[PDB]
Design an enzyme around this catalytic site. Sequence first.
Site, PDB file in Angstrom:
ATOM      1  N   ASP B 155     164.674  33.240  75.819  1.00  0.00           N
ATOM      2  CA  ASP B 155     163.714  32.903  74.772  1.00  0.00           C
ATOM      3  C   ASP B 155     162.511  33.840  74.814  1.00  0.00           C
ATOM      4  O   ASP B 155     161.366  33.425  74.984  1.00  0.00           O
ATOM      5  CB  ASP B 155     163.282  31.448  74.919  1.00  0.00           C
ATOM      6  CG  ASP B 155     162.326  31.005  73.829  1.00  0.00           C
ATOM      7  OD1 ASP B 155     162.589  31.298  72.639  1.00  0.00           O
ATOM      8  OD2 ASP B 155     161.308  30.367  74.167  1.00  0.00           O
ATOM      9  N   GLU B 396     166.360  29.035  84.890  1.00  0.00           N
ATOM     10  CA  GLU B 396     167.166  28.177  84.016  1.00  0.00           C
ATOM     11  C   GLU B 396     168.588  28.700  83.844  1.00  0.00           C
ATOM     12  O   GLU B 396     169.128  28.726  82.735  1.00  0.00           O
ATOM     13  CB  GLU B 396     166.488  27.996  82.653  1.00  0.00           C
ATOM     14  CG  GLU B 396     165.107  27.312  82.714  1.00  0.00           C
ATOM     15  CD  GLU B 396     164.571  26.942  81.336  1.00  0.00           C
ATOM     16  OE1 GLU B 396     164.982  27.573  80.334  1.00  0.00           O
ATOM     17  OE2 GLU B 396     163.741  26.012  81.256  1.00  0.00           O
ATOM     18  N   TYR B 449     160.127  19.189  79.986  1.00  0.00           N
ATOM     19  CA  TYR B 449     159.596  19.192  78.623  1.00  0.00           C
ATOM     20  C   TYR B 449     159.752  17.818  77.978  1.00  0.00           C
ATOM     21  O   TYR B 449     160.018  17.702  76.780  1.00  0.00           O
ATOM     22  CB  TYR B 449     160.287  20.271  77.790  1.00  0.00           C
ATOM     23  CG  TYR B 449     159.817  21.676  78.160  1.00  0.00           C
ATOM     24  CD1 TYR B 449     158.613  22.178  77.662  1.00  0.00           C
ATOM     25  CD2 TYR B 449     160.556  22.474  79.025  1.00  0.00           C
ATOM     26  CE1 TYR B 449     158.159  23.458  77.999  1.00  0.00           C
ATOM     27  CE2 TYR B 449     160.121  23.752  79.377  1.00  0.00           C
ATOM     28  CZ  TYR B 449     158.913  24.230  78.868  1.00  0.00           C
ATOM     29  OH  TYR B 449     158.476  25.492  79.204  1.00  0.00           O
ATOM     30  N   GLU B 485     157.189  24.778  84.780  1.00  0.00           N
ATOM     31  CA  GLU B 485     156.953  24.908  83.348  1.00  0.00           C
ATOM     32  C   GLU B 485     156.784  23.525  82.748  1.00  0.00           C
ATOM     33  O   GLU B 485     157.496  22.588  83.116  1.00  0.00           O
ATOM     34  CB  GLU B 485     158.102  25.592  82.607  1.00  0.00           C
ATOM     35  CG  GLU B 485     158.260  27.074  82.836  1.00  0.00           C
ATOM     36  CD  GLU B 485     159.310  27.689  81.922  1.00  0.00           C
ATOM     37  OE1 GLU B 485     159.589  27.097  80.848  1.00  0.00           O
ATOM     38  OE2 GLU B 485     159.849  28.766  82.274  1.00  0.00           O
TER      39      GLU B 485
HETATM   40 CL   LIG Z   1     159.565  26.878  75.708  1.00  0.00          CL
END
Ligand SMILES: [Cl-]
Lengths: 578, 578
Positions: B155, B396, B449, B485
Amino acid sequence: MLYPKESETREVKDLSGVWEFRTESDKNYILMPVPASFNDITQDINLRDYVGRVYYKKSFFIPVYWKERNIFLRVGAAAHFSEVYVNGNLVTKHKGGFLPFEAEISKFVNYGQENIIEIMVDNTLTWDVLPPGELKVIEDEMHPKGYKVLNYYFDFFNYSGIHRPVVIYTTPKVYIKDFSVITELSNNSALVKYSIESEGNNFQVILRDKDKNIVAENFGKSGVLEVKNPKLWEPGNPYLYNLEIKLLEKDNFDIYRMDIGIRTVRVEGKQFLINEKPFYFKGFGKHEDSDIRGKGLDQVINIKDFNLLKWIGANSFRTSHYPYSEEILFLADQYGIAVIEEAPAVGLNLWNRNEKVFTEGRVDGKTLEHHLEIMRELIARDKNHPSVIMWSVANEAATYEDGAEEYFRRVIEETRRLDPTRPITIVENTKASETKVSKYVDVICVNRYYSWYTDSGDLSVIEYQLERDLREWYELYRKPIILSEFGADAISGFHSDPPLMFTEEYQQEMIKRFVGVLDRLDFVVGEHIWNFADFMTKQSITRVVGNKKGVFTRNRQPKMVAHFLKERWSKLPDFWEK
Amino acid sequence: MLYPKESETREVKDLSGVWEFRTESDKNYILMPVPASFNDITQDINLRDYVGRVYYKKSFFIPVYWKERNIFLRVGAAAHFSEVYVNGNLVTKHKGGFLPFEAEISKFVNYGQENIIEIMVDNTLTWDVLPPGELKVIEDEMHPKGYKVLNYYFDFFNYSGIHRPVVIYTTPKVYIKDFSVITELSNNSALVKYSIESEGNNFQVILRDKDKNIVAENFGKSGVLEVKNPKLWEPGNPYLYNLEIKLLEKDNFDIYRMDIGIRTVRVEGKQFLINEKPFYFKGFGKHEDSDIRGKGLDQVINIKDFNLLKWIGANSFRTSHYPYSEEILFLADQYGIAVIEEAPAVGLNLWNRNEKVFTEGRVDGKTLEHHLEIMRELIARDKNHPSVIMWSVANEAATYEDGAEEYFRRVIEETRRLDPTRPITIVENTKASETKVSKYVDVICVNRYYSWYTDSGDLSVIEYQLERDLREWYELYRKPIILSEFGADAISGFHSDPPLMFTEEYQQEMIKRFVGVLDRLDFVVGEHIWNFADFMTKQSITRVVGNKKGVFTRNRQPKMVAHFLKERWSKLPDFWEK
Ligand SMILES: [Cl-]
Ligand SMILES: [Cl-]
């Protein structure tokens, strides 16, 4: 049921204003404006995202002189299930959040005294209401006990509340219940044919022009009014005549008036004819959506929107994806904007061919029954508006499924039976060769998002893909085609060169390239950009605080592409033989 | 290979500036700055999205007096495959876009005359380069002949070009090729142990403090320098000593100098110890990304970024997701910022358990071979920076796959063999009970997240889900944990109450609730917010012109949550026994 209008024989009392409001099984009230969605009024996030029943309450006084009158209580719209109580008495129930309902309540009122109205509204979706959804329980390793979600697959926020005015109105005991008007062109005249629904039978009907001159009259519960040298209603010339209906009986006297327009609509070959001339749609898919009030009716916003439609040079819009307020149709009549009015059959699609929609458990016979009742209610409400020129039975349903064919055959057949005077469409995002439903409508409406949802960012594919696709629609079905949606999200103030997704430049370039294709295709009779304005949706990583494909911001100011469309549409005639 | 530095015995010529540039099989050049990504420099969309080989060209003059010197040509970074030609002669090739490469070129230069350097750079990804991707042919009904896409699953945008400076430097024919430094604490002293790589053998080594006082000296190609009363390097006290190495032979004389820092790093139990004190990471995942130049080195942006790190009270960052320029590590040494430096093993995941990543055809033995060579190049470059305190082997990856276990066991084993002086981690988004890899590292780094990618918009789930998850990581692995994160996209100027996804309020509330959980967990030794600043990504309906999770805008100005973090981190000590 007729729109409540005051006359010599009818009073109207508007109950809009500040009501008391509470949620289910709670005794404390807060204040809540009506009409409005309740979701954005407070700073309570648990009310914003509430799912379940809410309760509105208000006091009102009935004059003693309303005795021996009919007293009607009308709710313009409440999403999605509603119950109305007068002094604790249930006077009516209603299913469907975008059409009005009413009851006669004289049996339950205290004359010359205080009365209490309470309205329950339930926003819980099911698979047999339109638009559909489902409440799901999620009690797994990562969710506490009692976690629930309302799932739904239409792309606008599930705003709830009383979205259109609540009013009480009187009529005489024998009164004009309804009427139907059809207009025809005959030699150098126009005919306005009418039938009145009433327990009365003696009627005088008068038609007046713009200057109050009487141009036609008839005694009769049914009949024909001849207008010599008619001025026809059309986009660019919204001429309205005023129809006055007077019931004259022994004990009862009633007057109802409505502005009507004289126009014909007909599809022939690849042409959409209004008053026997080839129309070209220039316009938008809209939404009933504005800041703070959600879906609530606001005449300031409505008049602003029509002035913007005239400013940008649009001549039409579609009521994506549900019937709009009657107020908006009366304005479209005044402004000369052609309306495709759409039933709330949106969300009949799980973007996934492994999950079937037209199947036991989801869209079934109960849903169909509701859809058919909706079409009856919608045509009964709006049959006399000149601005409505087409009915849309659905938006982006899963029309590739076998079960969709029988479902929509029945919907389409019933719609035509209810109103043979207007063409019928269905708005498709299915592939041309896969839909089992478009072969049954009068005009094809296709939504296409090449370079946005597919090949994201690559504007170079548009001409190749769009021309091939639209030629296949015409080759298979040989009907006029409206490009009923296309567009790109654009954040106001996001700019780039070369153009990037979410910039104003990308939105303008995409739209510009799409319409360059349409100009080369003589069977394309319309362009509707998605959307008129930015609007709210449920939250997701694909929605930047709602849907940002508006040509105008949510506060009704233009983005870059609004000026491109103004310049294009100022050069395109409303009537254009392609 | 040592960073090029001028001295009494070495010249450095920087070839950065304006180069000529062309794409494959094209004869016409344009102008292109170096260092910079080429994608955003022009208004040619076909160059922005170009996939294939590009060619840089520049003239340079070699002084006649460089004869009988070694002449090295160094390329700081070129993404992703590169070939370097001097007067048409191939002097080196390199694979991997984030580490430097060089060759000795005296055999190919024209002394006292014009020379031509040409650098080919290929941005085509494959499954055996890191980060991986694949060029795919798409010739179906909706794509013309020759349509191709570069697919990749990391990303950040696949910026390409020469991203770090190209320089030419001289050394004597017998010269200091490399050296290794390790620092230890002993009684009340510190020891700086060193070994030098050279064909020479007579060396004097001197260590100087901040005021140029000599505090230690040694004659020997290997040896130990004793520093009595050392001033240790750490966040909040970035003391650097200057190490001077002097080769003194009959015909050759060479001097190289480097600032070093005296500190130890050690994991014990649930503590991350720097200089035997319990550290708490406060910081960011960053990216090498800035307006217009893409991934190109810019010392203005670098110094701005470090001043912002000190302003907001951060003490650390991770080089997500690739080695950064050496320049940034020298600055982290000066500013006292602890760095987790990460290998470019990002994108080893097809967010889908039906598509396996660690399998023949994708991540295989060839990829592993490249990964192992990368770790060797990375440690060789950065082994002497005090600011690097941990290596991250991946971000990841699909660590739940059986094949991921053998792959990463080998990577981790080789990393520890190359550098036993720093702990090792891997950054996970796999579920705690599913990863087959985290049991092999020293510190757990987990990306979470909740309420953004899952249960989108519902901030109420955070405390329930995050505390349960992090307790399971500790219960399974009994290692210190960094929340490596967490964050939310926020468009600058998008505000709402109640908070909505993509607003500054939602970003701040999410981050605030996450760190409230961490404060209750004594095994959590760090918080890194994603991301330091907004950065570009490939185009998709989920990316609002790039990734908007920055705490700072792309032009390095703070969003609302930057001020929340400044206030929190001003109250949190760098060393904190939880
Ligand atoms: Cl992100
Ligand atoms: Cl859309």
